[PDB]
């Protein structure tokens, strides 16, 4: 077990620290933006949720343990950008129209119409109205998500209305045509103080997490405004990451029909994605395999100027000869390409005999030059608490095809543990190219009528 050092993430004025929460709270984001225009919709009551607690976000929200839960000074103090009660294009969604829409007994059409009720209001607003909305903000009530969701279940206490399936992915996918980033909130993500959902205790959240709960809420609502909070430095140039996860497209027919949403992270600090191909087993046929690389790898030609020297394509699935051989002659010539499969295949857990806390994260157990493990989850020296409360498991990282120094490989996956622009955590337990390709894989499969270029994260 040689220890892999914890990586670094940059912040304002080119500085380099190690914590996303701590660095922003003290240093700030890299790019300088002035203000954020918050196009906000939702029910009339929900307006009294977002509006006041939005003012709490630039107030100092304290943490009981500044070590484990880092500081949060505000919003203008941390992000150097202004957020205020202006631009609030409150498209009042009456509960009576939702009432005749929410209680429908259908599975998809209940979500299809209810999403459409939210969609047609925001769409016209960015078409006709006079706000420069950057982060669209759709506050969704509680009863809708409790009823309208995957395998939707509705009890029979107040039955009045009668007749993918997910609310979130259908919402995001439709806006790819309209090209608007949007933030969606559910339950008491904001109104946890006075919710007392089950009983008096706020079962959703707590004051301890509130210090960095508003970190995740703010950082999710900050990156979509064209900002660049933190960017990597230890990732070298000329290296292409293709984090791809095969996603089942249908739930009823053709179980072997699937599509892959291959992310493509650049060397110039671009968390770019790419559209893969629909490959019908569990493999990308050369018809689709050639198209992926010839398109995803092509972006280096105009984004930088030349093809990357190394191409680290990531996956949770092993390859076979047909996919890999297609990946050679389609485009990559004189440029290295390596297929790395990262998965929690077999549980190898390590336990510390002397002492009580769990294994520190960053441990790599060699098995071969082309296979090892990576403890990207576990104890953190800085926050003095393990990222995973339970005993963690490593990422079985083996080089399926190609030859590369796996120790050089291992610290590179660890490098992609902090580009997690959906939460404020010290490190994410998966590479960003593989973690963020699951949601976009879920977005691009919500509908079958999208022509998506290599779109960035903020719409997903």
């Amino acid at each position: 077990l040689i220890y892999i050092e914890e990586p670094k993430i940059l912040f304002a004025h080119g500085q380099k620290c190690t914590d996303a929460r701590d660095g922003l709270a003290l240093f700030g984001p890299l790019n300088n933006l002035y203000g954020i225009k918050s196009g906000v919709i939702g029910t009339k009551q929900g307006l009294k949720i977002f509006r006041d607690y939005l003012d709490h976000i630039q107030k100092p929200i304290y943490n009981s343990n500044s070590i484990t839960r880092p500081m949060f000074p505000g919003f203008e103090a941390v992000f150097d950008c202004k957020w205020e009660s202006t631009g609030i294009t409150f498209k009042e969604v009456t509960n009576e129209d939702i009432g005749k829409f929410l209680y429908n007994s259908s599975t998809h059409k209940r979500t299809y119409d209810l999403v459409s009720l939210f969609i047609d209001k925001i769409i016209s607003a960015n078409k006709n109205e006079d706000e420069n909305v950057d982060v669209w903000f759709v506050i969704v009530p509680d009863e809708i998500y409790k009823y309208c969701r995957p395998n939707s279940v509705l009890p029979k206490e107040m039955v009045q209305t009668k007749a993918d399936a997910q609310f979130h992915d259908q919402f995001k996918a439709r806006l790819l045509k309209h090209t608007i980033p949007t933030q969606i909130f559910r339950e008491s993500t904001l109104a946890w103080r006075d919710f007392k959902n089950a009983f008096g205790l706020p079962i959703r959240d707590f004051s301890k997490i509130e210090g960095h709960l508003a970190w995740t809420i703010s950082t999710a609502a900050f990156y979509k405004a064209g900002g660049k909070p933190w960017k990597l430095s230890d990732v070298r140039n000329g290296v292409c990451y293709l984090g791809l996860v095969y996603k089942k497209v249908e739930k009823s027919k053709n179980p072997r029909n699937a599509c892959c949403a291959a992310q493509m992270f650049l060397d110039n600090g671009d968390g770019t994605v790419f559209k893969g191909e629909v490959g019908p087993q569990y493999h990308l046929e050369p018809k689709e395999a050639k198209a992926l690389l010839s398109q995803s790898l092509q972006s280096y030609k105009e984004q930088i100027g030349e093809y990357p020297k190394e191409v680290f394509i990531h996956a949770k699935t092993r390859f076979n000869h047909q996919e890999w051989d297609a990946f050679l002659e389609v485009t990559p010539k004189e440029t290295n390409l390596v297929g790395v499969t990262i998965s929690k295949t077999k549980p190898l857990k390590l336990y510390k005999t002397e002492g009580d806390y769990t294994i520190l994260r960053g441990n790599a157990y060699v098995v071969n030059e082309r296979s090892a493990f990576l403890w990207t989850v576990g104890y953190v020296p800085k926050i003095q608490t393990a990222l995973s409360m339970e005993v963690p498991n490593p990422l079985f990282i083996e080089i399926n095809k190609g030859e590369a120094d796996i120790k050089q490989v291992l610290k590179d996956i660890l490098s992609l543990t902090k580009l997690n622009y959906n939460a404020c955590i010290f490190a994410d337990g998966e590479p960003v190219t593989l973690r963020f390709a699951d949601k976009i894989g879920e977005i691009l499969t919500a509908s079958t009528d999208i022509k998506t270029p290599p779109l960035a994260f903020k719409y997903y």
Binding site: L1, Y351, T353, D356, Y357, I359, L360, Y365, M389
Partner: protein
């Protein structure tokens, strides 16, 4: 319910928790008998709870007070409970055939750690 001063099965509110292991033999990286750690719950200490969601919920709330030591002593004691005579444990393939397997989990060495800052 103790093996070498190690409690393997105990109490949690009204649900009695039991430490359990799942063994999958692998020839990779080297011939090993890979063990997994699980917690399973019995209403009266003899019949498992026939509810996967409840068992999942109970296991999530039973490991709440379990740290690395609580996991390892329970695992090693249960594994050492399967030890045959002194330092191994045989798997019988025939009237004369046996497969001795070590009772002590493989040790690994690391040169970087934290200072245990309480």
């Amino acid at each position: 319910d103790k093996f070498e001063k190690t409690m393997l099965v105990g109490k949690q509110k009204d649900k009695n928790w039991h430490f359990a292991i799942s063994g999958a033999s692998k020839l990779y990286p080297f011939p090993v008998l890979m063990i997994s750690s699980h917690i399973f719950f019995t209403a009266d200490g003899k019949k498992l709870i026939d509810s996967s969601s409840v068992q999942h919920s109970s296991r999530r709330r039973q490991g709440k007070n379990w740290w690395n030591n609580t996991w390892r002593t329970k695992l090693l004691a249960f594994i050492k409970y399967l030890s045959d005579d002194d330092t191994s444990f045989y798997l019988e393939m025939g009237s004369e055939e046996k497969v001795f397997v070590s009772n002590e989990p493989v040790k690994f060495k690391g040169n970087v750690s934290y200072n245990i800052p309480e």
